[PDB]
Write a protein that binds this ligand. Sequence first.
Ligand code: HEM
Ligand code: ARG
Length: 241
Amino acid sequence: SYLWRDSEVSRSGSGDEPFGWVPEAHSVFTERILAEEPPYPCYFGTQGQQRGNNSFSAVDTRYPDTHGPAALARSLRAYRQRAWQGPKRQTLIVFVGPAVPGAELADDHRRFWTLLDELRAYDTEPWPADVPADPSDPRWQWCFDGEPWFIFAASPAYKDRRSRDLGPCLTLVFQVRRVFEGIGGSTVAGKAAKRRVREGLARYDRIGPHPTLGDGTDFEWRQYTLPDDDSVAAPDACPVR
Ligand code: HEM
Ligand SMILES: NC(=[NH2+])NCCC[C@H](N)C(=O)O
């Protein structure tokens, strides 16, 4: 019941109630993604926003038993069903709040991995057979509710990689793999997509595309939590589990 379309987010909370900080986080996020000049680097995200294809949820760290990982697992199951109907290019954006002034990027990434770990406990489906369960396997991807996802962390502590600063809260961006159908890495369209996004990053960010994004697949976990510099994590060092 915490899965929201744009028009529903304002009813999340009002004032100091649980989620009372969500409507403002939603507005900061949409302002970032819809900004005109320079445009947000990912036109897919911008187009998804414009087309009503982004859904939202939240975690309120003050109330983990009612507004935390158990509820987010329910929201994610509902989102997964939604993501397989209508437009292929949908995204779920989950704000984790209230915001913590001065948090370091490493702290927000720690919080990200901890939240994924807490979700695994609430998964009602077995881990997919086509995906290795061992997070040190080159082919590991995070899975939930019977399928792999692409998931990444955004944080206000991304100072140079501004594309990943979506507002004052740690923000989790979830997609089922369906979003990439038609823009695989070998495809003409997929190469054009990476060109276009990376041109956008070269007009928006203070640091270029991270090496773990590739030239334009092993150890995808490193993409979930890009650093703010050119450091490259050890491949077998995924924090999950
Ligand atoms: C609110 C939704 C979205 C946000 C906030 C978002 C954000 C980003 C960001 C920050 C990047 C730069 C690389 C990175 O930091 O990981 C990126 C790249 C990209 N996004 Fe999105 N995105 C969104 C939706 C989508 C959707 C729906 C697709 C579906 C096709 C998509 C496809 C891509 C691709 C292909 C890249 C390029 C990867 C590369 O150059 O190697 N995005 N996006
Ligand atoms: N935000 C992003 N980096 N999006 C692109 C994710 C693509 C994903 N690594 C794949 O193999 O399909």
